[PDB]
Design an enzyme around this catalytic site. Structure first.
Site, mmCIF file in Angstrom:
data_model
loop_
_atom_site.group_PDB
_atom_site.id
_atom_site.type_symbol
_atom_site.label_atom_id
_atom_site.label_comp_id
_atom_site.label_asym_id
_atom_site.label_seq_id
_atom_site.Cartn_x
_atom_site.Cartn_y
_atom_site.Cartn_z
ATOM 1 N N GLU A 1 33.996 -25.389 23.260
ATOM 2 C CA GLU A 1 33.746 -26.649 23.950
ATOM 3 C C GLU A 1 33.658 -26.439 25.462
ATOM 4 O OE1 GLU A 1 36.566 -29.750 22.967
ATOM 5 O OE2 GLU A 1 35.068 -31.320 23.262
ATOM 6 N N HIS B 1 30.349 -34.734 18.688
ATOM 7 C CA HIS B 1 31.144 -35.964 18.720
ATOM 8 C C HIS B 1 30.690 -36.899 19.852
ATOM 9 C CE1 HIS B 1 33.099 -33.049 21.256
ATOM 10 N NE2 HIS B 1 34.038 -33.881 21.670
ATOM 11 N N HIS C 1 29.500 -34.363 25.630
ATOM 12 C CA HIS C 1 30.128 -34.099 26.943
ATOM 13 C C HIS C 1 29.166 -33.824 28.114
ATOM 14 C CE1 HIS C 1 34.500 -34.410 26.615
ATOM 15 N NE2 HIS C 1 34.403 -33.928 25.389
ATOM 16 N N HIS D 1 33.787 -32.174 14.764
ATOM 17 C CA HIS D 1 34.749 -31.777 15.803
ATOM 18 C C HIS D 1 36.200 -32.179 15.502
ATOM 19 C CE1 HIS D 1 35.288 -30.313 19.964
ATOM 20 N NE2 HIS D 1 36.273 -31.193 20.018
ATOM 21 N N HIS E 1 32.467 -29.356 29.013
ATOM 22 C CA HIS E 1 33.554 -30.263 28.604
ATOM 23 C C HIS E 1 33.659 -31.390 29.656
ATOM 24 C CE1 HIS E 1 37.882 -31.437 27.738
ATOM 25 N NE2 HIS E 1 37.257 -31.663 26.597
ATOM 26 N N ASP F 1 36.384 -36.184 16.230
ATOM 27 C CA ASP F 1 37.218 -35.827 17.388
ATOM 28 C C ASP F 1 38.711 -36.095 17.101
ATOM 29 O OD1 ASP F 1 37.687 -34.771 20.001
ATOM 30 O OD2 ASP F 1 37.487 -36.738 20.932
ATOM 31 N N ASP G 1 40.258 -30.904 16.976
ATOM 32 C CA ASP G 1 41.030 -30.082 17.927
ATOM 33 C C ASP G 1 42.406 -29.633 17.393
ATOM 34 O OD1 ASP G 1 39.628 -32.201 20.403
ATOM 35 O OD2 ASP G 1 39.178 -30.067 20.227
HETATM 36 CA CA CA Z 1 37.781 -33.243 23.377
#
Ligand code: CA
Ligand code: CA
Ligand code: CA
Ligand code: CA
Ligand code: MG
Ligand code: MG
Lengths: 382, 382
Positions: free
Chosen positions: B132, B222, B201, B21, B159, B292, B23
């Site tokens: 996500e 993650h 999550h 993961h 999420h 992450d 972003d």
């Molecule tokens: Ca995140």
């Protein structure tokens, strides 16, 4: 049996007849609500409409641009209607892909000139996709590029609704008076990404402007001739000439209202009149076939459903159109346009032309951007 | 220079380190607003964040699941927020594809075990995609299948927002109490289409139910270990055991809050503690790396950005984890899960399992359906 019918059958096996527009995916949404599990008996022999998988084989069709049409948004809240249309577009693209995937002996997905031919060599109907209106993209060029990735290879600029990019033909008064400023900019992006421009359903002035601006050849996926039958949806002699300079193709429509003043008088002969008119005046390399089957309740006499394509091929040969010119009208022309659209896109993408980006909101304030820059410099010290 | 550092460098060239993961696509939306034209200097050397193309090369990363995250919808009108999130998802998928396409020497798109390896043979970072949260699909399974077609290969069920399918970890009170009835049905569809389930999550009870129900191995893209550090986002010993039976992989997260009670105390050593804990108790074939990066402001000491992966590989070797087990943790494990997810989907699709369809409105009344059936029978008479 007839020498002309044997000749037509041979041509249909030699080269693919590629039809410009069919709304069979919308029939599936209307009748099945896109649930085709255990519905093969009905998909091969439909209780409604002008298209099913048995009659599709019977007519010897070589390829098809399947329409991922959704209706113009009717919600008074316009933001919601536009976003609703985007979700419905993904539903219609989904059922098209599932229709192709569940029937691999009949249908094979194609998104290029090469993939059309390989599908035709294997005895499949080359199954391409087109969307019908820029209302379907929800004002998002990012979404449009993702639709290209999902297999969409033409975009009709409008349906029976004006959008932010162009004017439709059937709605008045005019909004943009042809293409908007956004519309002109979208023409560049459509040429760059390798998306075929479709000028059916758009206003005469929007056609003229698009035909002059486009760097790649365009199509009319389902439009007929204005001089033979005056209609907002038909192509004028002016735009036929600009289509010739553009190197595009007018794919002649079977809609009865576009062929005759009284719809019940429309026939196969009228479709042939329109093909010969265009072929005589702008050459047979710029004419195609664009039925609009399942976008109408009833077809012309002799063109009632997708099984009737051999009668059209035989009728063209019977009227003195040469074999080579009939092959062009059947599919070679629309293959050429798709090939040239791809070639123009590869040139512009190879030269590193900048793509059109959506206008996005700021998600970070200046406080968050300061925290990030201060954090980056702390990492640089290490 | 150190024998351990030479060993780590060799392993990174032998097998791809595939991170679960990152972003970086959301950083591009925050900083550039997805307009990367003429921004190569900045994309190689970013003024913000933990990821750029020079540091990505420097850390010798073999592959990456790039996050197409968008925030949970905050509009009080929930229909609009859900549809807004769908459009934003297509924007983030678009900028990921443009990032890969504009930098083909560094990044290469991958959507399978074979495409990961071919990317790694060519010296590229294998660029995969994950979304996500099921808020991103706008309650549309058709849209979800189209996201798979756009290159999405995992879906985090939630999420920091509850959705119609599952409960997130960080929000209370509970909505469904694990998976909803819809959620259970979606697990079957995700297994059928070949979409990798991501349980990061999601709530502990939702993990337990999903781990028992899923016919394919899942991942935690993650997440870290609950026994070492108690957090709603970390994996319990119960769910670690059910992950073992599932044949899944827990990809250990670098989030400081998931590694230490005081976030500023978090280190590279803590990440190694978590990998060794999981590897000792459920085998090193069920553990991975799920940074992450760019989902946090600051990383642990020694894992500040994407250039720091060689220190992690060296640290694992220094603590007595065998070369073969380090290779497993680096990427062989997550490749295996993706391979098995694809193999399960090919089995179920080969057996002709029925796909999950969306609930659609009727578009035709009984009057239109009568007209169509009456028209069909008229054609049958001809
Ligand atoms: Ca995140
Ligand atoms: Ca139509
Ligand atoms: Ca109709
Ligand atoms: Ca942040
Ligand atoms: Mg003329
Ligand atoms: Mg245990």
């Amino acid at each position: 049996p007839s020498p002309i019918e044997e000749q037509a059958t041979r041509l249909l096996k030699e080269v693919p007849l590629i039809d410009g527009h069919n709304d069979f995916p919308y029939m599936i949404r209307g009748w099945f609500r896109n649930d085709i599990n255990g519905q093969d008996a009905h998909l091969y022999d439909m209780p409604i409409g002008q298209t099913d998988l048995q009659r599709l084989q019977k007519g010897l069709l070589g390829g098809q641009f399947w329409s991922a049409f959704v209706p113009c948004p009717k919600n008074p809240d316009k933001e919601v209607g536009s976003l609703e249309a985007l979700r419905q577009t993904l539903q219609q693209l989904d059922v098209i892909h599932r229709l192709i995937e569940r029937h691999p002996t009949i249908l094979q997905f194609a998104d290029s000139a090469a993939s059309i031919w390989s599908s035709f060599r294997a005895g499949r109907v080359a199954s391409l996709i087109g969307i019908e209106g820029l209302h379907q993209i929800a004002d998002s060029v990012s979404a449009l590029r993702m639709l290209h990735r999902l297999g969409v290879r033409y975009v009709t600029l409008t349906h029976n609704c004006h959008n932010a990019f162009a004017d439709a033909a059937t709605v008045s008064p005019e909004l943009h008076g042809g293409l908007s400023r956004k519309g002109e900019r979208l023409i560049r992006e459509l040429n760059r990404m390798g998306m075929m421009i479709d000028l059916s359903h758009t206003s005469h002035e929007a056609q003229t402007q698009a035909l002059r601006l486009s760097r790649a050849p365009v199509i009319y996926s389902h439009s007929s001739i204005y001089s033979l039958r005056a209609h907002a949806r038909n192509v004028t002699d002016e735009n036929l000439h600009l289509l010739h300079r553009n190197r595009g193709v007018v794919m002649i429509c079977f809609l009865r209202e576009l062929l005759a003043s009284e719809a019940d008088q429309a026939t196969l002969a009228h479709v042939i009149d329109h093909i010969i008119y265009a072929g005589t005046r702008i050459g047979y390399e710029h004419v195609g076939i664009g039925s609009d089957f399942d976008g109408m309740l009833r077809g012309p006499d002799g063109l009632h459903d997708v099984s009737c394509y051999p009668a059209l091929v035989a009728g063209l040969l019977e009227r003195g159109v040469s074999e080579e010119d009939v092959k062009r009208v059947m599919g070679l022309n629309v293959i050429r346009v798709l090939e040239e659209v791809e070639r123009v896109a590869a040139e512009l993408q190879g030269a590193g032309e900048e793509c059109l980006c959506d206008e996005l909101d700021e998600v970070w304030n200046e406080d968050i951007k300061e925290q990030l820059t201060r954090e980056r410099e702390r990492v640089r010290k290490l």
